[PDB]
């Protein structure tokens, strides 16, 4: 009895735009996703791959209904909706606090449960080099941390918040290969039964997906197999 529970996603007549009365990048988009399913979102450049991820996070002017595990996005807080998602890549917002608060903002885990997730995402050697380890306060954003380590923190932060839908926007080209490998390893351990929406521009970068979505013109066509995509 928790939310999000499985990662089932249902989109119905979704229309996204960047300004009030602007051009509809996506119009009347509707599909559905099974819990824990690896979904590949295919689309050429400028087709609207990034726009669909921004529409999921209510970061644009969106009309239509999206629901996760039966819970509509009109039925919870905006902050509680985005917490169900894990977003990579992104401009990582580092809290003005310790490594612990940045990894466990809600203070729901012990330092043993945090260090184990930190070891999986490859942040073990990055935290141990600071005096106090998890108690090292991160100030001025996270300037002491690399850009790739910030995304590992965002990845580890998503695991500790128990997100069920992981959004990946062209990780094969817009992430360091080391970072992509660590995420793919997380998808077989902590994120083993979580929904992953893989957005790429070439089919070769989304072979391991069970289902596929193609952004043809301003529509989204659905395919349940790679055979004749
Ligand atoms: N701030 C923005 N404001 C208005 N329109 C935008 C904005 N960002 C993207 N778009 C428009 O929305 C369309 C698709 O945008 P989007 O960036 O999501 O496609 P994309 O698949 O991510 O392409 P790419 O990643 O190669 O840049 C484009 O026609 C683009 O002009
Ligand atoms: Mg993009």
From Swiss-Prot:
<feature type="binding site">
    <location>
        <position position="18"/>
    </location>
    <ligand>
        <name>ATP 2</name>
    </ligand>
</feature>
<feature type="binding site">
    <location>
        <begin position="43"/>
        <end position="50"/>
    </location>
    <ligand>
        <name>ATP 2</name>
    </ligand>
</feature>
<comment type="function">
    <text>Epithelial ion channel that plays an important role in the regulation of epithelial ion and water transport and fluid homeostasis. Mediates the transport of chloride ions across the cell membrane. Possesses an intrinsic ATPase activity and utilizes ATP to gate its channel; the passive flow of anions through the channel is gated by cycles of ATP binding and hydrolysis by the ATP-binding domains. The ion channel is also permeable to HCO(3)(-); selectivity depends on the extracellular chloride concentration. In vitro, mediates ATP-dependent glutathione flux.</text>
</comment>
<feature type="domain" description="ABC transporter 2">
    <location>
        <begin position="9"/>
        <end position="229"/>
    </location>
</feature>
<comment type="subunit">
    <text>Monomer; does not require oligomerization for channel activity. May form oligomers in the membrane. Interacts with SLC26A3, SLC26A6 and SHANK2. Interacts with NHERF1 and MYO6. Interacts (via C-terminus) with GOPC (via PDZ domain); this promotes CFTR internalization and thereby decreases channel activity. Interacts with SLC4A7 through NHERF1. Found in a complex with MYO5B and RAB11A. Interacts with ANO1. Interacts with SLC26A8. Interacts with AHCYL1; the interaction increases CFTR activity. Interacts with CSE1L.</text>
</comment>
<protein>
    <recommendedName>
        <fullName>Cystic fibrosis transmembrane conductance regulator</fullName>
    </recommendedName>
</protein>
<feature type="lipid moiety-binding region" description="S-palmitoyl cysteine">
    <location>
        <position position="194"/>
    </location>
</feature>
<comment type="similarity">
    <text>Belongs to the ABC transporter superfamily. ABCC family. CFTR transporter (TC 3.A.1.202) subfamily.</text>
</comment>
<feature type="topological domain" description="Cytoplasmic">
    <location>
        <begin position="1"/>
        <end position="229"/>
    </location>
</feature>
């Amino acid at each position: 009895d928790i939310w999000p529970s499985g990662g089932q996603m249902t989109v119905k007549d979704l229309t996204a735009k960047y300004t009030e009365g602007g051009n509809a990048i996506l119009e009347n988009i509707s599909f559905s996703i099974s819990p824990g399913q690896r979904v590949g979102l295919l689309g050429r450049t400028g087709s609207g791959k990034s726009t669909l991820l921004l529409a999921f996070l209510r970061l644009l002017n969106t009309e239509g209904e999206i629901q996760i595990d039966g819970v509509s996005w009109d039925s919870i807080t905006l902050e509680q909706w985005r917490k169900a998602f894990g977003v990579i890549p992104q401009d990582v917002f580092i809290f003005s606090g310790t490594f612990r608060k940045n990894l466990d903002p809600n203070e729901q885990w012990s330092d043993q449960e945090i260090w184990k997730v930190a070891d999986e995402v490859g942040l073990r050697s990055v935290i141990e080099q600071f005096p106090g380890g998890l108690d090292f306060v991160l100030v001025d954003g996270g300037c002491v941390l690399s850009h790739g380590h910030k995304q590992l923190m965002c990845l580890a932060r998503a695991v500790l918040s128990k997100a069920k839908i992981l959004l990946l926007d062209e990780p094969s080209a817009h992430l360091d290969p080391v970072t992509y490998q660590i995420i793919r390893r997380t998808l077989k351990q902590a994120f083993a039964d979580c929904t992953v929406i893989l957005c790429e521009a070439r089919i070769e970068a989304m072979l391991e997906c069970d289902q596929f979505l193609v952004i043809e013109e301003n529509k989204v066509r659905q395919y349940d197999s790679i055979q004749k995509l």
